[PDB]
Amino acid sequence: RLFQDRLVEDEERRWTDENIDTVALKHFPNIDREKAMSRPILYSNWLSKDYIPVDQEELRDYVKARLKVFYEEELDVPLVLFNEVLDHVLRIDRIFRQPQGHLLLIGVSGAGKTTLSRFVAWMNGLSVYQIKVHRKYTGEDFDEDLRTVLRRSGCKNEKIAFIMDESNVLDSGFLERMNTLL
Amino acid sequence: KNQMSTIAGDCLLSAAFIAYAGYFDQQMRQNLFTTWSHHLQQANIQFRTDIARTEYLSNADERLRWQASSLPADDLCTENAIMLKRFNRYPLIIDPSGQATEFIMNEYKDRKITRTSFLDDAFRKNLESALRFGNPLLVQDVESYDPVLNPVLNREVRRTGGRVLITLGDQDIDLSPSFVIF
């Protein structure tokens, strides 16, 4: 979830996975491999209250079930579920449930971004805050927005999926504010 | 009956011509169409080998309408006039001639269309007034691009009810098959 996800190439992902297997078998002796690691190593806090290992059939049944209940809730356009969007939804939920999570999704335009996040925020009870852009958009308005969302997150004890686009990052001096915020 | 039996390759290729090959010139348009047709013939779909896009997708009624209109006798511009109607999302017209403006403001009269552009002074509030009204436009010369119409170009999903559609920034939107902006 930390390293194999970020790599561009499927060959790089395969090399990372097989070396994960290699290091696990090298420094975890006398342990059966078929239980030590498998292909669907997936965890969620929804099947139980523990991150129990989840097999392909039950996780796919869950993902069909959640999309079936999400059909009539918000999205009138049918979201298509498959091997990559399932993985990305579980990755984004793991990052949301982790403390101080902060995810950099690098990929082509459209393709699932700002709809996977909106969907996950809707099914997890989070709030969505987006920044509008006018002319002469100074950093003071952004600072006020950051102050209000920080007081909502801390003072009003409310988990926030603060989402930002490439259209509200045109200025330069306020970019490093998120750096020290992280 | 034969058209139902071999509608597959032909209408798939015509729709793919509308979708993908709109940026390219006549040479690349025809190269894409012929390569697609050869591969579809190799895909056990035996269709009309001799098909032109203006004779398959569109009809001679609108062909004669555009020929008798101010549009000149030229296959590229008649094909683009066909593309002006068989589209889905808001397009751009990359043109050095700019003759589409008189087309739009000549065949668009009953909607009380307004002449708007990008470099004019009537854009800091006329764009907002056009968003409030819900009227089509042909704003031109995109070199000082306004990032506030990205939600309009993006067509977000927000369902609350039903009225005259406009994809605003910070206000509720609706759905209707009436308005489209160029």
Ligand SMILES: Nc1ncnc2c1ncn2[C@@H]1O[C@H](COP(=O)(O)OP(=O)(O)O)[C@@H](O)[C@H]1O
């Ligand atoms: N896996 C997917 N299944 C179905 N539709 C998808 C998928 N990924 C992206 N889309 C579609 O691609 C479009 C691009 O999304 P995007 O424009 O980023 O959403 P937004 O309108 O919030 O900006 C969306 O309208 C979405 O319906």
